Specification:
The PDB classes it as hydrolase. Keywords: alpha/beta dehydrogenase, hydrolase. It forms a monomeric assembly. The chain is α/β, with parallel strands linked by helices. It has one domain. A nine-stranded mixed β-sheet has the order 1-2-4-3-5-6-7-8-9, sandwiched between helices. α3 packs across α4. The longest helix is centred in the middle third of the chain and has 15 residues. The two termini are 17 Å apart.
């Protein structure tokens, strides 16, 4: 597998606050960003194993990058180029956030610091709340995306039958802002039956669970991105069959992938 990066994984490795790749960062100004509000790019400094897949992450309604910043280096240190974005306005709705995520991914191919560190065929989108609805919107607009991970996603669009991207839907059991019954689980149910997809509900969690480090969110996001952005079979073991972590109150999937 030419996209395999890093040593063979374990539970400890996917839980790591920092994986083996040392991470640096660079800024995209608001004016440099066409179609989004700027962002921070986190990237592995080690180029000796080849190029990396790229991930764009959107915050939710009223939020800046500070609510998603922890994901940037935590994911990048597993071997990914990750951009955490600011939106055009903090009031932007999910469809617009989806366009902004795509614009951020397109920007990485032009950025002088990271354009030669990225494999242009291996990209993914993630987001919190309205940014998670944006991740689903971006996947619906671009069927070549390799992974989509909405965290406590919110969207008025409930039908995702046009998505062709492997999608991990992360819900919070006690979310009152984006209740799983009408948001996260509804999205899972309308994604195609023939898609590689999973729904992971975090026990006892509120809508804000993604705003500060959460090991369960990180470890399964990392395993999902490794499996689908890197085609890394070594990570299938964490996704299929259902993980038994106490922090997970429900897991649904189309395993085996």
């Amino acid at each position: 597998n030419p996209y395999e990066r890093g040593p063979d994984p374990t539970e400890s490795s996917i839980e790591a606050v920092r994986g083996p790749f040392a991470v640096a960062q660079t800024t995209v100004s608001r004016l440099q960003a066409d179609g989004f509000g700027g962002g921070t790019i986190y990237y592995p400094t080690d180029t000796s194993q080849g190029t990396f897949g790229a991930v764009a992450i959107s915050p939710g309604f009223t939020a800046g990058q500070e609510s998603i910043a922890w994901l940037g280096p935590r994911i990048a240190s597993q071997g990914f180029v990750v951009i955490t974005i600011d939106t055009i306005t903090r009031l932007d709705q999910p469809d617009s956030r989806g366009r902004q995520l795509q614009a951020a991914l397109d920007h990485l191919r032009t950025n002088s610091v990271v354009r030669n560190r990225i494999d242009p065929n291996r990209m993914a989108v993630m987001g919190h709340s309205m940014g998670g609805g944006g991740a689903l919107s971006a996947a619906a607009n671009n069927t070549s995306l390799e992974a989509a991970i909405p965290l406590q996603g919110w969207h008025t669009r409930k039908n995702w039958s046009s998505v062709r991207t492997p999608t991990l839907v992360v819900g919070a059991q006690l979310d009152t802002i984006a209740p799983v019954s009408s948001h996260s689980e509804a999205f899972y149910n309308s994604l195609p039956s023939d898609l590689d997809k999973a729904y992971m509900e975090l026990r006892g969690a509120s809508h804000l669970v993604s705003n500060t480090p959460d090991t369960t969110t990180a470890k399964y996001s990392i395993a999902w991105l490794k499996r689908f952005v890197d085609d890394d079979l070594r990570y299938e073991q964490f996704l299929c069959p259902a993980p038994d972590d106490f922090a997970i109150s429900e897991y649904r999937s189309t395993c085996p992938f």
